[PDB]
Amino acid sequence: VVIGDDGRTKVANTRVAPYNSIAYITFGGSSCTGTLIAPNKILTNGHCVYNTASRSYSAKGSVYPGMNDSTAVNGSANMTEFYVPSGYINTGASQYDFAVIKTDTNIGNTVGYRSIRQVTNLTGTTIKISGYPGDKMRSTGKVSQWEMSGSVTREDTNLAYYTIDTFSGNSGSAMLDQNQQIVGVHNAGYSNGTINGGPKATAAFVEFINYAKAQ
């Protein structure tokens, strides 16, 4: 959700880290954000790849790392396989709302990719959320990356929360710490649109990702 005044700013250079590793990803009926985490693996939200209500996987599309002004400035890859946690398939709960996508080429070796840091507590940590919101697509007519930083204001055992502004299309944006490590993935608005949040990189998160990295 966008909370009060919009604090997001346009990423000026998507040819450098970490922005070159953050991708506009398309499906047959929607788009999201994702982040390269291996030579041929993207991390995003579960709800981007699997619809709980229809029990349906999304139609596969394409991956554009560091797209800016609707230009694939670092090339593109196609999606080939989805890996979704069993818990997401079975409950649709926010604590399992993450997924990995394999690409057809090793595009992560050209632009680089991000590591994941397992965390226990994020309260007070400054994170950055950068990705591809749909509202900016409407208003500028271009697909560009927008970022905003802020503090994690509360958390529970699986989720972290923040007032950093997000809009549809930001689903799957990584939470990046000061060292450009992934500590979680944005998924939704909470508390009737007064805060945003998503799953932290817990031990359970990291185990699934490690399995997915081996596929």
Automatic annotation (TrEMBL):
An example molecular function term from Gene Ontology annotations: serine-type endopeptidase activity
TM region positions: none
Cysteines engaged in disulfide bonds, as pairs: C32-C48
Stretches assigned to the Peptidase S1 domain: 10-209
Keywords from the named record: Hydrolase, Protease, Serine protease, Signal
EC numbers for this chain: 3.4.21.-
Superkingdom of source: Bacteria
GO BP terms: proteolysis
Family: Belongs to the peptidase S1B family.
Protein name stated in the entry: Serine protease
Organism per entry: Bacillus intermedius
Residues of the full protein shown: 89 to 303 of 303
